[PDB]
């Protein structure tokens, strides 16, 4: 596998590591999303320590309004992050 293919696999792997913890196994609830960000995105995003920030991030990502972040909505988040990284080069 190429670096791009490895990246594709890592996206799938990390989403499901967190989404499968509790409740719906195919979606991230607030606590699963918070832990994903805090543990896995610490070089790109400040640690989330406040409920209001958890709530706002979920509200931002939950495009379909069901209160959880599904895989499509997670991919849109990843695109936001990758796009923002352009500021650094």
């Amino acid at each position: 596998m190429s670096e791009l293919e490895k990246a594709v696999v890592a996206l799938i792997d990390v989403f499901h590591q967190y989404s499968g913890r509790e409740g719906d196994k195919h979606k991230l609830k607030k606590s699963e999303l918070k832990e994903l960000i805090n543990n896995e995105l610490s070089h790109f995003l400040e640690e989330i320590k406040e409920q209001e920030v958890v709530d706002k991030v979920m509200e931002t990502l939950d495009s379909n309004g069901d209160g959880e972040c599904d895989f499509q909505e997670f991919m849109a988040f990843v695109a936001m992050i990758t796009t923002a990284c352009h500021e650094f080069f």
Partner: peptide, 9 residues
């Protein structure tokens, strides 16, 4: 690589 939260939210 710190992205300001305000550019995400």
């Amino acid at each position: 690589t710190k992205i300001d939260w305000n550019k995400i939210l």
